[PDB]
Design a protein around this ligand. Sequence first.
Ligand SMILES: [Fe+3]
Lengths: 37, 157, 192, 229
Amino acid sequence: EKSKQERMTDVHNKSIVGKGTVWYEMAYEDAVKERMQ
Amino acid sequence: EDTNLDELRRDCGRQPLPRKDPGVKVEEEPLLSNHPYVDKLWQIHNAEQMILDDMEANPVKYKGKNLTELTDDEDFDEENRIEYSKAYYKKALLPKMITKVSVKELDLEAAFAERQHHNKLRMEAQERGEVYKIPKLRRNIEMDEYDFIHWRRSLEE
Amino acid sequence: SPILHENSDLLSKRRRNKFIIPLHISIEIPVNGIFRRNSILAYFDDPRYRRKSSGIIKDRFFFIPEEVHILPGSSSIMVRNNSIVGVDTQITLNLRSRVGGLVRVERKKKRIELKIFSGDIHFPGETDKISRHTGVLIPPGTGKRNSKESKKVKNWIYVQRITPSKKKFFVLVRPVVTYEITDGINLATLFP
Amino acid sequence: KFELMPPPYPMNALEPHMSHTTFEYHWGKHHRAYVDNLNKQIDGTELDGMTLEDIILITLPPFNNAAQAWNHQFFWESMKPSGGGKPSGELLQLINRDFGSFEAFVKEFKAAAATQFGSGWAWLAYKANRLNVGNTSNPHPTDEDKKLVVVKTPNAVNPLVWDYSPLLTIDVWEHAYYLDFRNRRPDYISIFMEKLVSWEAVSSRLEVAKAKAAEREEEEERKKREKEE
Ligand SMILES: [Fe+3]
């Protein structure tokens, strides 16, 4: 009825079908700094 | 004639209009560094870069006309520029706000000199065998200075 | 149009609750255009970590490449099951083996699965009580510098026990690859 | 339990411009009261066994008394019965850099002590503050960020509370001059700015403040190195 999270899960499955455990999970700024440093 | 209730309350001496009390503490809060002119500076930077890159694509068009003095349209207006368009949608459909920078607003001489120096260093680094990289342009540094002075104002406040 | 020096970082600025990225990695948005919590927007699949070999990796991962050939059921195979074939071995009428090793022929209902496990065949001794069904990977052993003729194995090898017969079993040392999750971080600068 | 600290100069014969009857009354009464009250209100509490600054920054009923004593002692120490008239050393450099001249600084101190309008202490402070909210850090930091600022504080308020560093103080409270002389405050202010201010203690405190600022800057670099390592 309200706050249905179906569309988000659907577009996430269309973008990434295999929801495997993320080997590398990090913030954007941290990744940019690691690329710099 | 009265259209603002706060002005009426101040004129008649009555108390201010009641408002719901926010639970945040103004003393302990993150400072504000974003500058209002940053958006216009970014848009004029993009317009300058685009017009300068497009003068390269059409050398005949750039020839015969000075970079400092140029006119795209005589009856161009900022009001007519603002519009909403959602016809083109690759993944998402939303209104495309259009902004038309003024001709005199852009100072094309500095952009032309900058691009000349940048492509000279680009071809030089390609002769070296490495891709040329530049950290920041002038207008971006000016925007950073605007943000810095705004942050100084907020810190002093 | 485009330029020779394409640096999208110098043309994009990030503000409070406002991210402006110049479209020219790729990104996708929903039909309505709204986003949600933990919503993936851009994809950064890097071809540097891609592999052409059929073998897939499974802090660091090991990938053992294996030559797998999917042939039809009515295809005539010129190789026998559990047979050791060398390089350039004619497996089919127009298909030749690219790597030498043990040939495994898995005959399914409507598909012929031919697998060539490349590696050195070693005969384990009596005291070599290695796991038959549990393959063990050996890393680079720190060989002592005293021994001169001790060839240092700088590459990791995957030892797999192949038991074609109930009484005779062999050990195959297949190759391995290096895939590190922590090592390797490449992402194009999006915001200045 | 803190005890009242005697002033450096002999209270009876320190300065002909401040009566010893006056000196005595003011000093004794105020210091004693603050300390005892303070000692009474901190006894059997976690605040006991700590310095005044700790207490000042923590406190509440044990605030007003502590600050006043601390301010009062600082005030006594801020002066000796000689040597007034002009500062020197790094004091002059910092004064002419920010204020522009020594006379401008004197006029600002006078026009800040005069306009307190009630019970207050005037202060000359070396501004080295570090905020704990949002983007406190300053990009492209350089000199001229730490400055000498002349601030006016209300009753029982000290600049210690806003991470400022206290260098020089005038006690603009009635007890200081009302008893001594007819109550014209500019007189007392002028005489303070003339014949009692001691610049040597101010130079020492400026040195201490620059040392604390340097230690904070080096702590920042240590934290950055720990981040890199
Ligand atoms: Fe006093």
